[PDB]
Enzyme design. Structure first.
Site, mmCIF file in Angstrom:
data_model
loop_
_atom_site.group_PDB
_atom_site.id
_atom_site.type_symbol
_atom_site.label_atom_id
_atom_site.label_comp_id
_atom_site.label_asym_id
_atom_site.label_seq_id
_atom_site.Cartn_x
_atom_site.Cartn_y
_atom_site.Cartn_z
ATOM 1 N N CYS A 2 2.317 1.476 -8.850
ATOM 2 C CA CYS A 2 2.119 1.361 -7.417
ATOM 3 C C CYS A 2 2.074 2.803 -6.886
ATOM 4 C CB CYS A 2 3.191 0.543 -6.717
ATOM 5 S SG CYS A 2 2.893 0.471 -4.921
ATOM 6 N N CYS B 12 3.799 3.321 -3.364
ATOM 7 C CA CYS B 12 5.209 2.947 -3.145
ATOM 8 C C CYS B 12 5.887 2.487 -4.440
ATOM 9 C CB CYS B 12 5.364 1.985 -1.952
ATOM 10 S SG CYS B 12 4.368 0.499 -2.072
ATOM 11 N N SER B 13 5.916 1.179 -4.713
ATOM 12 C CA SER B 13 6.703 0.775 -5.862
ATOM 13 C C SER B 13 6.375 -0.617 -6.324
ATOM 14 C CB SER B 13 8.205 0.830 -5.511
ATOM 15 O OG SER B 13 8.482 -0.058 -4.375
ATOM 16 N N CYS B 14 5.386 -1.195 -5.733
ATOM 17 C CA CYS B 14 5.087 -2.608 -5.935
ATOM 18 C C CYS B 14 5.013 -2.988 -7.418
ATOM 19 C CB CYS B 14 3.784 -2.919 -5.236
ATOM 20 S SG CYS B 14 3.818 -2.251 -3.546
HETATM 21 FE FE FE Z 1 4.801 -0.354 -4.025
#
Ligand code: FE
Ligand code: MG
Ligand code: MG
Ligand code: MG
Lengths: 212, 196
Positions: free
Chosen positions: B100, B103-105
């Protein structure tokens, strides 16, 4: 928003801090770390106060230096706090009083967002698309490395979701769109300066147009 | 370019909790329930189960690769950040890797919450541009006859990698196979290892 969070392709970082299968430790490394996500869900599911998209965007709205020196879970503490103040649920005074000190928040938005696009195309697997050459100051789920670039559709989702650029600002006009897995050759994105093969970006219909 | 003045993060996080909780906005047991879900339920053991089933059940493999949501639902593993699932198949000429960049998905219910390294600026910046070097540095050499394909988790699709099944596992039980499908295999930065 062309913020510092849009990191893909940035050069100068060192090694990823991991070797495969190394021990990552517990899920939470401090006793507060479950709070940001939990309280995000309170806000979304229990209060109805904001969307997940608004959480992504408020983290993008951290002052850029602040973003760069803040650990991951802390960014979401800051972001959820910020939304609760912006939505009139909490005050910054009460946050700082309870915290015993400063609790700086993300910066105010400088865009009202934009609606779901009126005119879009339903694309098919195998079709060539270009990412629309557009600049969006508010939230957008398009990393800049693919803006204006060409790729081919690998999947059209069988579900639809609100347009981020609208719902990430709490607007009423996010509609719904499917997304598309768009496969780009590495060289399309980074020229000669890549060691990869292909990159697949999951792009909302409204970010795409037919290729030439 | 100095950092802003800040109270300790622990104080800020619990201040946010207390401000909301003191207004009646957080149900009894709410954050503690989420902590338990995050710690105990969301887990890469689930994705490992799914991989092992795919490796031993051609019909399920096909389902997982065509309608990952449906396949996952059979096990009851849909959930938050894991509602629309696509599994991506490694092959003798293709290695898949997930990130991601924004972000961090992550497909939380079947991979677990992301590890710190996956959320690092280093990984987010570099794997989309130089995945071969990143994987090498992390301990995974991808032979030069394999295309690397990086999936950037920019919308609602949540991915898992279906790695190739290694030689030396023929006839293993689902339990035996699950043990070698690690979190990093599901993310795509590791290949399943068979002991000596
Ligand atoms: Fe993310
Ligand atoms: Mg940029
Ligand atoms: Mg850049
Ligand atoms: Mg076999």
């Amino acid at each position: 928003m062309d913020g510092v969070h849009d990191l893909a392709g940035v050069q100068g970082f060192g090694k990823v801090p991991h070797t495969v299968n190394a021990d990552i430790g517990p899920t939470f490394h401090a006793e507060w770390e479950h709070l940001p996500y939990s309280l995000m869900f309170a806000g979304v599911a229990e209060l109805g106060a904001f969307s997940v998209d608004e959480v992504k965007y408020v983290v993008e709205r951290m002052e850029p230096r602040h973003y760069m020196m803040t650990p991951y879970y802390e960014r979401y503490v800051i972001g959820v706090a910020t939304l609760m103040v912006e939505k009139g649920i909490l005050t910054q005074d009460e946050l700082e009083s309870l915290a015993g000190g400063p609790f700086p928040l993300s910066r105010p938005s400088e865009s009202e967002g934009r609606p779901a696009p009126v005119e879009t195309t339903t694309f098919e697997v195998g079709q060539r698309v270009r990412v629309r050459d557009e600049y969006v100051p508010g939230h957008i789920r398009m990393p800049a490395y693919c803006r204006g670039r060409v790729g081919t559709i690998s999947h059209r989702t069988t579900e639809k979701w609100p347009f981020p650029d609208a719902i990430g600002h709490g607007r009423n006009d996010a509609g719904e769109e499917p997304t598309y897995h768009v496969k780009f050759a590495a060289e399309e994105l980074f020229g000669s300066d890549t060691d990869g093969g292909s990159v697949v970006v999951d792009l909302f219909e409204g970010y795409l147009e037919p290729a030439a | 370019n100095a950092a802003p003045a800040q109270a300790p993060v622990s104080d800020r996080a619990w201040a946010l909790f207390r401000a909301l909780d003191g207004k009646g906005l957080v149900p009894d047991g709410y954050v503690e329930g989420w902590k338990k879900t995050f710690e105990e339920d969301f887990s890469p053991r689930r994705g490992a189960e799914l991989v092992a089933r795919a490796w031993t059940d051609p019909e399920f493999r096909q389902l997982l690769l065509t309608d990952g949501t449906a396949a996952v639902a059979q096990y009851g593993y849909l959930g938050p950040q894991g509602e629309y699932i696509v599994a991506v198949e490694d092959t003798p000429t293709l290695k898949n890797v997930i990130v991601c960049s924004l972000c961090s998905c992550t497909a939380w219910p079947i991979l677990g919450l992301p590890p710190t390294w996956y959320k690092s600026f280093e990984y987010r910046a570099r794997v989309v541009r130089e995945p071969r070097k990143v994987l090498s540095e992390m301990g995974t050499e991808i032979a030069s006859d394999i295309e690397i394909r990086v999936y950037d988790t920019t919308a609602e699709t949540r991915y898992m990698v279906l790695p190739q099944r290694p030689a030396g596992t023929e006839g293993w039980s689902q339990e035996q196979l699950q043990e070698i499908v690690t979190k990093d295999c599901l993310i795509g930065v590791a290949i399943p290892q068979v002991p000596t």
